[PDB]
Amino acid sequence: MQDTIFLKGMRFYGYHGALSAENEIGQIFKVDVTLKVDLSEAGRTDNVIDTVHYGEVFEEVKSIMEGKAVNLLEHLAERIANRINSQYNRVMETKVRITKENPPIPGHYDGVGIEIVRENK
Amino acid sequence: MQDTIFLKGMRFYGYHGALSAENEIGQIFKVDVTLKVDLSEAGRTDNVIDTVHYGEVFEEVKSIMEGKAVNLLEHLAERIANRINSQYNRVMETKVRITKENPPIPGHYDGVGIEIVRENK
Amino acid sequence: MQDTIFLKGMRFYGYHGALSAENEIGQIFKVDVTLKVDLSEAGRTDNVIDTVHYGEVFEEVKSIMEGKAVNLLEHLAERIANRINSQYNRVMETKVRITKENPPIPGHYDGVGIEIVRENK
Amino acid sequence: MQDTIFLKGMRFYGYHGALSAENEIGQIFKVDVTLKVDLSEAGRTDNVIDTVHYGEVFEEVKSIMEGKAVNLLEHLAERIANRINSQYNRVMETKVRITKENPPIPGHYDGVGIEIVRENK
Amino acid sequence: MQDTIFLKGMRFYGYHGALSAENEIGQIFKVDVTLKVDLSEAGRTDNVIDTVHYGEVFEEVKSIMEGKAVNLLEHLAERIANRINSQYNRVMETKVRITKENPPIPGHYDGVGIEIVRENK
Amino acid sequence: MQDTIFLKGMRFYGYHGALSAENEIGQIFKVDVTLKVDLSEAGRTDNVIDTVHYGEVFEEVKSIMEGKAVNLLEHLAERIANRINSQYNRVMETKVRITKENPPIPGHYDGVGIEIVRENK
Amino acid sequence: MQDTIFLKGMRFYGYHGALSAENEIGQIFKVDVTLKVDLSEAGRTDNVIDTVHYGEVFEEVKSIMEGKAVNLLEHLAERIANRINSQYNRVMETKVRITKENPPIPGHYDGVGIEIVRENK
Amino acid sequence: MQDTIFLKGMRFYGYHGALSAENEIGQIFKVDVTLKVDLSEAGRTDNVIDTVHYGEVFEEVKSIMEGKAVNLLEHLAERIANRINSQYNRVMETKVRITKENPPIPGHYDGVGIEIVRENK
Ligand SMILES: Nc1nc(O)c2nn(-c3cccc(C(=O)O)c3)nc2n1
Ligand SMILES: Nc1nc(O)c2nn(-c3cccc(C(=O)O)c3)nc2n1
Ligand SMILES: Nc1nc(O)c2nn(-c3cccc(C(=O)O)c3)nc2n1
Ligand SMILES: Nc1nc(O)c2nn(-c3cccc(C(=O)O)c3)nc2n1
Ligand SMILES: Nc1nc(O)c2nn(-c3cccc(C(=O)O)c3)nc2n1
Ligand SMILES: Nc1nc(O)c2nn(-c3cccc(C(=O)O)c3)nc2n1
Ligand SMILES: Nc1nc(O)c2nn(-c3cccc(C(=O)O)c3)nc2n1
Ligand SMILES: Nc1nc(O)c2nn(-c3cccc(C(=O)O)c3)nc2n1
Numbered sequence: 001m002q003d004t005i006f007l008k009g010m011r012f013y014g015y016h017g018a019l020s021a022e023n024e025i026g027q028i029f030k031v032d033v034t035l036k037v038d039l040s041e042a043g044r045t046d047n048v049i050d051t052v053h054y055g056e057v058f059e060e061v062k063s064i065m066e067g068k069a070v071n072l073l074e075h076l077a078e079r080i081a082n083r084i085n086s087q088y089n090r091v092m093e094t095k096v097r098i099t100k101e102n103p104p105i106p107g108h109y110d111g112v113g114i115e116i117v118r119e120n121k
Numbered sequence: 122m123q124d125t126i127f128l129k130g131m132r133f134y135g136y137h138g139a140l141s142a143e144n145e146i147g148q149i150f151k152v153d154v155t156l157k158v159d160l161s162e163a164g165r166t167d168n169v170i171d172t173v174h175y176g177e178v179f180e181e182v183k184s185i186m187e188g189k190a191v192n193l194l195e196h197l198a199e200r201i202a203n204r205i206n207s208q209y210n211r212v213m214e215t216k217v218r219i220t221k222e223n224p225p226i227p228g229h230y231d232g233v234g235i236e237i238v239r240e241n242k
Numbered sequence: 243m244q245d246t247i248f249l250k251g252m253r254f255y256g257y258h259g260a261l262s263a264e265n266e267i268g269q270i271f272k273v274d275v276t277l278k279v280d281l282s283e284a285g286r287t288d289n290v291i292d293t294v295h296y297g298e299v300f301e302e303v304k305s306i307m308e309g310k311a312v313n314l315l316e317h318l319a320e321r322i323a324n325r326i327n328s329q330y331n332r333v334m335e336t337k338v339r340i341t342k343e344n345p346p347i348p349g350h351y352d353g354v355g356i357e358i359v360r361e362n363k
Numbered sequence: 364m365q366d367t368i369f370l371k372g373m374r375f376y377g378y379h380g381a382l383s384a385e386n387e388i389g390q391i392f393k394v395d396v397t398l399k400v401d402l403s404e405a406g407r408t409d410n411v412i413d414t415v416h417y418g419e420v421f422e423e424v425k426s427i428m429e430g431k432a433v434n435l436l437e438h439l440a441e442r443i444a445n446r447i448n449s450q451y452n453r454v455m456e457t458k459v460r461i462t463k464e465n466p467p468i469p470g471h472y473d474g475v476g477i478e479i480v481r482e483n484k
Numbered sequence: 485m486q487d488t489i490f491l492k493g494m495r496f497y498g499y500h501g502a503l504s505a506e507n508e509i510g511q512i513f514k515v516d517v518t519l520k521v522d523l524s525e526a527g528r529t530d531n532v533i534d535t536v537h538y539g540e541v542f543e544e545v546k547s548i549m550e551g552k553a554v555n556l557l558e559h560l561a562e563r564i565a566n567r568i569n570s571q572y573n574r575v576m577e578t579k580v581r582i583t584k585e586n587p588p589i590p591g592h593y594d595g596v597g598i599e600i601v602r603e604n605k
Numbered sequence: 606m607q608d609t610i611f612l613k614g615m616r617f618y619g620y621h622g623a624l625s626a627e628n629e630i631g632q633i634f635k636v637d638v639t640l641k642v643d644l645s646e647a648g649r650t651d652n653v654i655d656t657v658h659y660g661e662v663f664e665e666v667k668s669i670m671e672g673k674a675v676n677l678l679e680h681l682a683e684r685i686a687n688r689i690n691s692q693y694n695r696v697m698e699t700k701v702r703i704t705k706e707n708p709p710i711p712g713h714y715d716g717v718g719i720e721i722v723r724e725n726k
Numbered sequence: 727m728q729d730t731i732f733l734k735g736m737r738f739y740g741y742h743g744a745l746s747a748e749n750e751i752g753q754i755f756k757v758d759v760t761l762k763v764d765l766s767e768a769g770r771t772d773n774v775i776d777t778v779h780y781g782e783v784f785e786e787v788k789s790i791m792e793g794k795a796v797n798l799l800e801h802l803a804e805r806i807a808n809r810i811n812s813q814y815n816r817v818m819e820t821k822v823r824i825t826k827e828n829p830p831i832p833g834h835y836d837g838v839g840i841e842i843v844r845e846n847k
Numbered sequence: 848m849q850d851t852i853f854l855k856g857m858r859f860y861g862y863h864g865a866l867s868a869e870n871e872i873g874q875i876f877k878v879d880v881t882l883k884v885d886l887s888e889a890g891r892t893d894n895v896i897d898t899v900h901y902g903e904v905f906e907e908v909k910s911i912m913e914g915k916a917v918n919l920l921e922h923l924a925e926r927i928a929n930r931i932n933s934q935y936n937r938v939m940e941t942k943v944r945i946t947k948e949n950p951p952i953p954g955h956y957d958g959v960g961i962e963i964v965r966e967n968k
Binding site: 374376382383384385387388389390391464465467469470471 | 495497503504505506508509510511512585586588590591592
Binding site for chain 7: 709718
C-alpha cells in the first residue's frame with residue numbers, strides 16, 4: 001500500500017531551541033507531514049468521511065509548532081506523530097520532517113533538522 | 122523493472138473541493154503522473170508505437186481535471202489512474218499525485234494533497 | 243535621496259475580496275513595503291533611534307492585513323501607507339505593493355495585484 | 364502618479380511565430396501587463412467600481428493570446444495594449460511584456476521577447 | 485552498495501522528436517545520469533584512476549544528445565546507458581532520465597519524459 | 606520611447622578572465638541583452654522585416670562569447686554592444702549585462718559582473 | 727553614464743543587531759553592491775588596470791560584514807560605501823543593499839533591510 | 848528504523864580537484880549529510896544529550912571541506928563519513944553527497960558529483 005496524504009512546507013514562527021537566545025528571539029520552522037493512508041475507498045466514494053481531512057491535520061501540527069517552546073525538534077516531531085496517529089485510526093503510519101532553515105550555526109547551508117517515521121499502533 | 126514515463130507539474134484550473142465556496146471560485150490543481158512501463162523495446166526500435174505517447178496521457182488527465190467538479194482529490198486521482206491503466210496495457214502500474222497549492226486552509230505552506238499508486242490488472 | 247527601508251514578501255492569510263466566496267475561504271496575500279528614509283544619521287550613529295524599526299512596521303502591516311476583511315487591495319494598501327506615514331515623520335514617502343497570488347481567476351499566472359506610492363505630508 | 368495594477372506571469376499555449384513549424388507545434392507565451400491607474404479613489408471607497416477589475420483584463424489578454432496565430436509578439440502586445448486602453452478610460456498607459464521562453468533558437472537562455480508601453484489617448 | 489556518481493540537469497539543444505516540426509525547430513533536452521559505482525577505493529586512494537571521470541561521461545552524453553536526431557527519448561536514453569556501461573566496467577548499473585521541458589503538447593506543465601535503469605553486463 | 610527587445614539569461618561556456626587558470630579551465634558566462642527599438646510599426650504590420658530578429662542577435666552574442674578569450678567582461682560587453690549597434694540601425698541603444706556566476710573569488714555570492722549601455726550612433 | 731560593476735547576493739554570517747540575543751547567536755546577512763563606473767576605457771583596452779577588480783571589493787565588504795558587530799545595517803552599509811568610495815576614484819557612486827533574511831521578527835516574509843546610495847566625493 | 852538527522856546544502860569554498868588550475872582558483876562545493884539515528888529517546892526526553900548536535904557535525908564537515916586540498920570528492924566524502932561515524936556511536940550509518948556545481952567541464956548542467964553511504968562499525 002503506497003497511498004499517502006501529505007502537507008508540505010508548513011511554516012511556523014516558534015521559540016524552540018536548546019539555546020536561551022533561540023527561545024528569546026524565535027525562528028521559522030518548516031514542517032513536512034506525510035501520512036500512509038489507504039485512499040481507495042474515498043477514491044471510490046468521493047465522500048470526505050472516507051479519508052483524513054488535511055485541514056484538521058494542519059491544525060494539530062500548528063498547535064504543537066506554535067505552542068510551548070521545547071528544546072528539540074525530535075520532541076516536536078514526536079508529539080506531532082503521536083497526536084496524528086492517536087486521533088486517526090486510518091493513518092497506518094506518520095512521517096514528520098522538521099527543518100530549521102536558520103539555526104544558530106555560523107555557516108552557509110540550506111537547512112538543518114530531523115525526520116521521524118512512526119507507525120500507528 | 123524500473124523504467125518509467127512521467128508527466129510533471131501539470132496544472133489545471135478546476136472547481137473540485139468539499140466546500141461550496143471552492144466549487145464556486147475554483148483553484149489550481151497540480152498533477153504528477155508516473156507510469157511504470159518497460160521501455161527497452163522502444164529503446165531498441167525508436168518506433169513511437171512501442172511506447173506510451175505522453176501527449177495522449179496529458180489529454181486523459183486534462184479531461185478529468187478540467188471536467189465535472191468532485192469533492193475529493195482521491196476521487197480525481199482514482200479516475201485518472203483507472204483511465205490510464207484501462208487504455209494502456211503497457212502501463213504495469215500508475216502513480217498519481219495531486220496537489221492543492223492553495224486550499225481553503227488558513228496558514229503558510231507549500232501545498233496539500235494525496236498520492237496513489239494503482240497496479241494495472 | 244535614494245535611501246530606503248524595505249520589508250519584502252510579507253505573507254498573511256486573509257479574507258479580503260469583492261466576492262462572497264473569497265471572504266468565506268480566504269487566501270494568502272503577499273505584501274512588499276518600501277520606505278523612503280534618509281539613513282545617513284543612523285549610518286553615522288549606529289543608534290536604532292535614528293531610523294525606522296522594521297519590526298514595528300511589520301506589526302502595522304500585519305494588523306491591517308490580518309484584520310477586518312475589505313473588498314479591495316487598493317483599500318488595504320491605502321490604509322497601510324496612511325498608517326506608516328502617520329506614525330513616522332522620518333518616512334518621506336511610502337510604497338505598498340499587494341499581490342493576490344491565487345485569486346478566483348480561471349487561468350495560469352504568477353499573481354495579480356496593485357502598487358501605490360504615497361508621499362508623507 | 365506611480366500607482367499601477369498588474370498581472371504577472373500569465374501563460375498561454377499558442378501558435379504565433381514567423382516560422383511554419385512554430386504555427387504547427389505551438390509554444391508557451393508568458394505575458395506581464397502593467398497598468399498605470401490612479402488608485403486613491405478606490406483606496407478611499409473600497410468600491411470595486413472605482414478601479415479596474417484584474418479578472419476582466421486577464422480575459423482580454425487571454426482572448427488575444429489564445430486566438431488566431433500571428434507572426435510577431437509585437438503584433439500581439441500591440442493588440443493587447445490597444446484593447447485595454449480602449450475599454451478602460453481609467454488606464455492612463457499600458458505596458459505589455461511578452462516572453463517566448465522556448466523559441467526555435469539553438470541555445471541556452473531563459474527567454475526572448477519584447478516589451479511595449481502605450482499611453483491611452 | 486549505495487555509492488553513485490551523478491551528472492544533473494545536463495541540457496542540450498537537439499532535434500529529436502516523432503514530429504517533423506520538432507526535427508525542424510529543435511528544443512532543449514534535460515538529462516540526468518546516475519551511475520552505481522563502488523567509490524571506497526577512490527575514497528581511500530584519492531587517485532582519479534580509481535573512479536569514473538564525470539567529465540568523460542558528460543562528453544558521451546553530449547555526443548548522443550547533440551548528434552543525429554531520433555524519434556524517441558527511449559532510444560536516446562538506451563544509447564547513452566549502453567555507451568556508458570560499455571566503456572566503464574566500474575559502472576555496475578546506469579540510470580538515465582531525459583526530460584522534454586517544452587514538448588509540442590498544448591498545456592501547462594513542468595516537463596515530460598522517461599527514465600531507464602540499465603545494469604552493466 | 607520605452608519599447609525594447611530582450612534576450613535574457615543567455616549562457617555560454619567560455620575562457621575569458623584575467624587569470625591564467627581561468628583561461629585554462631573556463632566557466633559559464635551569463636548574458637542579458639536589452640535593445641531599445643521602436644516596435645509600433647512591427648506591431649501594426651506583423652511583418653518580421655519591421656523589427657529585429659532575436660535569433661540573429663543571439664548568434665552575434667554567441668560568436669563573441671564562445672570566441673577568442675579576452676581578459677575583461679567590459680571588453681566582451683563592449684564588442685557585443687558595438688556589433689549590435691553596427692548591424693541594426695533600428696536599435697537606438699544597446700544594454701549588455703554580463704555575469705560571472707562562478708568567479709575565482711573565495712566566498713559565497715550569487716554572481717559578479719558588469720553592465721554597459723551604449724547608444725547607437 | 728549608466729555603466730556599473732556589481733556583486734550580488736553576497737552572504738556573510740554575522741553578529742550585528744540591536745538585540746543582545748542577535749549578537750549572541752548571529753545570522754546570515756545578504757549584501758548587494760552596485761558601483762557606477764565608466765567602463766568604456768576598459769572595454770576598449772581589455773586591461774584590468776582600467777577598471778575596478780570585483781575580487782578586491784568583495785574583500786572590503788567581507789572585512790566589514792564579518793568584523794566587529796554593530797547595531798544597525800545602516801551603519802554597516804555606511805562603512806562599506808565609505809570604504810569603496812575612498813579607495814576607488816573610478817567609482818562615481820556606491821549603492822549598498824543589506825538584507826536580513828531571518829530577523830527576530832515573528833512572521834512570514836522573504837526579508838527585511840535597507841539600501842543606501844552614496845556618491846563618491 | 849527510518850529516523851534521520853540531516854544537514855542540507857552546506858557550501859564551502861575549496862581547492863580540491865584533480866586539475867592544477869582547480870587547486871589554484873578553487874570553487875564552491877555543496878554538501879548534504881544524512882545520518883541514520885534512532886530519535887525516539889530524544890523525542891521522549893527533549894534532552895539534547897540524547898541525540899546528535901547538528902552544530903557539531905557541520906563543524907566536522909567544514910574542517911574537512913575547508914582544509915587541505917585533495918583530488919577527489921570520493922576522498923572528501925570518505926573522510927567525512929569516517930569522521931562522523933567515529934565520533935558518534937549513535938549514528939548507525941552516514942550518507943554524504945558532494946556536488947561540484949561549477950566544475951571545469953565545458954557544458955550546461957546543474958552539477959556533478961558523488962554520493963556515498965557508510966555504515967558505522
Ligand atoms: N506570525 C505569527 N503567527 C502565529 O500564529 C504565531 N504563533 N507564535 C508563537 C507564540 C508562542 C510560542 C511559539 C512557539 O513556537 O513556541 C510560537 N508566533 C507567531 N507568529
Ligand atoms: N484557463 C483555463 N483553461 C481551461 O482549459 C479550463 N477548464 N476549466 C474548468 C471548467 C469547468 C470545470 C472545471 C473543473 O475542474 O471541475 C474546470 N477552467 C479552465 N481555465
Ligand atoms: N495562520 C494564520 N495566522 C494568523 O495570524 C491569521 N490571521 N487571520 C485572519 C483572521 C481574521 C481576518 C483576516 C483577514 O485577513 O481579514 C485574517 N488568518 C490567519 N492565519
Ligand atoms: N491548455 C490549453 N488551454 C487553452 O485555453 C488553449 N488555447 N489554445 C489555442 C488554440 C488556438 C490558437 C491559439 C493561439 O495561440 O494562436 C491557442 N491552446 C490551448 N491550450
Ligand atoms: N547552442 C548549441 N550548442 C551545441 O553544441 C549544439 N549542437 N546542436 C545540434 C546539432 C545537430 C543535431 C542535434 C540533435 O540534437 O539531434 C543538436 N545544437 C546546438 N546548440
Ligand atoms: N558546451 C559548449 N558549447 C559550445 O558551443 C562552446 N564553445 N566553447 C568555447 C570554445 C573556445 C573559446 C571559448 C571562449 O569563451 O573564449 C568558448 N565552449 C563550449 N561548450
Ligand atoms: N562560516 C563562517 N565564515 C566566516 O568567514 C565567518 N566570520 N564570522 C564572524 C566572526 C566574528 C564576527 C562576525 C560579525 O559579523 O560581526 C562574523 N562568522 C563566520 N562564519
Ligand atoms: N569565504 C571563505 N570562508 C572560509 O572559511 C574559507 N576557507 N577556505 C579554504 C582555505 C584553504 C583550503 C580550502 C580547501 O577547500 O582546500 C578552503 N576558503 C574560504 N572562503
